[PDB]
């Protein structure tokens, strides 16, 4: 949920909620949102109907997830290289220098 | 009406990182893309995979 497009009509509560009118309106809405985008336009009748778009943001989610994984690593008792199974987290060392703690634990 | 695309690539990279962590294989093998870290000697990044294979 990053963008939401809200469609307003003047008279929309005067529907049987199960008749052909709702079916046609929902089919029209589905087709219009399927065929729209950049380079395509929508024709809106004035003084009876509007069209708005609401936005959001995703700022610091990956850092939050990395912090939670760091807590898991801290509680588990095993080196982050083993659990995350991803090097490059630190600068390129010789080799065993990062794994000495794990080797001591294994010993 | 305009919008924006701010942090999608980092989101996708984080999800791929979760896949790498769960799979049990080094990121070099799965992502098949070096340069992720600085230029090392060679086998230094692949020692974990070699230990797993042994």
């Amino acid at each position: 949920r990053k963008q939401q497009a809200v469609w307003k009509v003047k008279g929309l509560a005067e529907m049987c909620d199960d008749d052909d009118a709702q079916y046609a309106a929902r089919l029209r809405l589905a087709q219009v949102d399927d065929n729209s985008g950049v380079g395509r336009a929508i024709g809106i009748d004035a003084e009876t109907e509007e069209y708005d778009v609401l936005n959001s943001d995703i700022s610091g989610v990956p850092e939050f997830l990395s912090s939670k994984m760091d807590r898991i690593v801290s509680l588990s008792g095993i080196h982050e290289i083993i659990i995350k199974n991803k090097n490059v987290g630190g600068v390129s060392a010789s080799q065993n220098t990062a794994l000495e703690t794990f080797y001591k634990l294994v010993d | 009406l305009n919008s924006d695309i701010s942090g999608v690539p980092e989101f996708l990279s984080s999800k791929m990182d979760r896949i790498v962590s769960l799979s049990g294989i080094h990121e070099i093998i799965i992502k098949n893309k070096n340069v992720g870290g600085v230029s090392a000697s060679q086998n230094t990044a692949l020692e974990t995979f070699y230990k797993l294979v042994d």
Partner: peptide, 23 residues
Amino acid sequence: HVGSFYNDNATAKRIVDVIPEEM
């Protein structure tokens, strides 16, 4: 029951089995 958690989660399985195999 820890059996279901061990079976379903890969992280718990790795945590349990990483040490004995290395030894």
